[PDB]
Amino acid sequence: LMREHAVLKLRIIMETAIVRYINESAELNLSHYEDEKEASRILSEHGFPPLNHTLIISPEFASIEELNQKALQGCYTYILSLQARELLIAAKTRRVEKIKKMQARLDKVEQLLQESPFPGASVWLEEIDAVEKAIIKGRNTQWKFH
Amino acid sequence: LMREHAVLKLRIIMETAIVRYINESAELNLSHYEDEKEASRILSEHGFPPLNHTLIISPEFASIEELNQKALQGCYTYILSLQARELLIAAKTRRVEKIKKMQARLDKVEQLLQESPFPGASVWLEEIDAVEKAIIKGRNTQWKFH
C-alpha cells in the first residue's frame, strides 16, 4: 500500500503535464527547434517538471527510497515520445478521466493506510473470499477448471 | 531482388509524406480536432496517401503480389503515431538523408537487376568470398571462432 501510494502521486505528477503540453503545443511550436538539447532547454523554461519516465511506467523492483530518489532526476522523454495520434480531443478526454480515476484511487489508498487493526485489513478479507471461491470451483471441476 | 525493389519504392512513398507533414503540421494544427476520424478526414483532404504501415515497415512473409495488393489500402496510422521527438530539425535532416540513401539504393537495385548472365550475379560472388573467408577463420581456430 505504501508503494502504491508513492507511485500514484508520481503518476498524477506525470500526466498533469502531458495534458498542458497537449494544450500548449500550438503556442509552443516544437518543430522550430533543432535537436533534443534545445527542445529540452525550451521545455525547462516553461515550467515542465523533469521526470524519469521508465521508473514511473515500470517500477519493477524499486524500493520506495529508490523510487523517490531517482524519479526527479531525469529528462523530458515522457513528453517527447508522444505520438501525434494522442494530440486529439478524445485523447484529452481520456487522459483527464484517467487522472480523475488515479486521484480517486490515491484517496482510497491513503484511507486504507489507517484502518483497524492494521493497515490493509479489508483487502485481505476480500482475497480470502476470492481464494475460497477459486478452491471451491477447482474442487468441483476435478481440478480441471472447465 | 524483386522483393527489395518493391519495398524500396513503397518506403520512398511512405516517408515522402511524413516529411511534408512535419513541414506542414505546425499550421495544420492537429491538436484542434476532436478524434482520429476527423483527423483522418482532414489528412485525406490535403493529399496524404493511405498506407498500411505495419506491412510497409515489416514485410515478413508477404509475396510481391500481396505486397503491392494490400499495402496502399490502409489508413493514416503512419502519420498519427509520430512522437513529438520526431518534430525537431535534426530528425527532419536525418529523414532527408535517409530518403537520399533509399533513392540511391533503389537505383542500385534497378541497375543490378539487368546484369549478365542472370540477375544478381555479382552479389553471389560476394557471398562466395564471405563464406570462404569464414570457413578459413573457422578452420584456424579449431572451429571455436576466437
Is B85 in contact with A90 (Cβ distance < 8 A)?
Answer: no
Cβ of B87 under 8 Å from any chain A Cβ? yes
Cell of A98: 484517467
Q: Does A27 touch chain B (CB under 8 A)?
A: no
β-sheet bridge partners, residue B51 = B75
> Is B6 within 8 Å of B105 (Cβ atoms)?
no
Q: Which of B30, B83, B92, B93 best tests the A interface by mutation, with the highest count of A CBs <10 A? A: B83
> Residues B76, B39: contact at Cβ < 8 Å?
yes
Residues 6+ apart with CB under 8 A from A112: A1, A119, A120, A122, A123
Q: For residue B36, which residues of chain A lie inside 8 Å, CB to CB?
A: 85, 88, 90
Q: Is A37 on the interface with B (CB under 8 A)?
A: no
Closest to A43 (Cα-Cα) out of B95, B29, B87: B87
B42 shares contact with chain A (CB less than 8 Å): no
- Would an 8 Å CB–CB cutoff place B27 in contact with chain A? no
Name the residue among A35, A38, A83 with its Cβ closest to that of B81. Answer: A83
Residue A90: which residues within 8 A CB-CB, separation 6 or more? Answer: B34, B35, B36
- Compare all CA atoms of chain A with the CA of B79 and give the residue at the minimum distance: A84
Asked if the C-beta of B20 comes within 8 angstroms of chain A's C-beta atoms, the answer is no
B111 touches A at CB < 8 Å = no
**Cβ-contact A84, B81 below 8 angstroms:** yes
**Secondary structure, 3-state, chain A:** CHHHHHHHHHHHHHHHHHHHHHHHHHHHCHHHCCCHHHHHHHHHCCCCCCECHHHHHCCCCCCHHHHHHCCCCCECHHHHCCEHHHCCHHHHHHHHHHHHHHHHHHHHHHHHCCCCCCCCCCHHHHHHHHHHHHHHHHHHCCCCCC
CB contact under 8 A, B36 and A85: yes
Residues 6+ away with beta carbon under 8 Å from B20: none
A81 and B81: CB-CB below 8 Å?
no
Verify whether the Cβ–Cβ distance B31 to A39 is below 8 Å. Answer: no
- What are the CA-CA distances from residue B124 to residues B90, B108, B118, B121, B129 (Å)? 38, 15, 11, 6, 9
CA distances from A46 to A26, A49, A101, B30 (A): 14, 9, 27, 22
What kind of experiment solved this structure?
cryo-EM
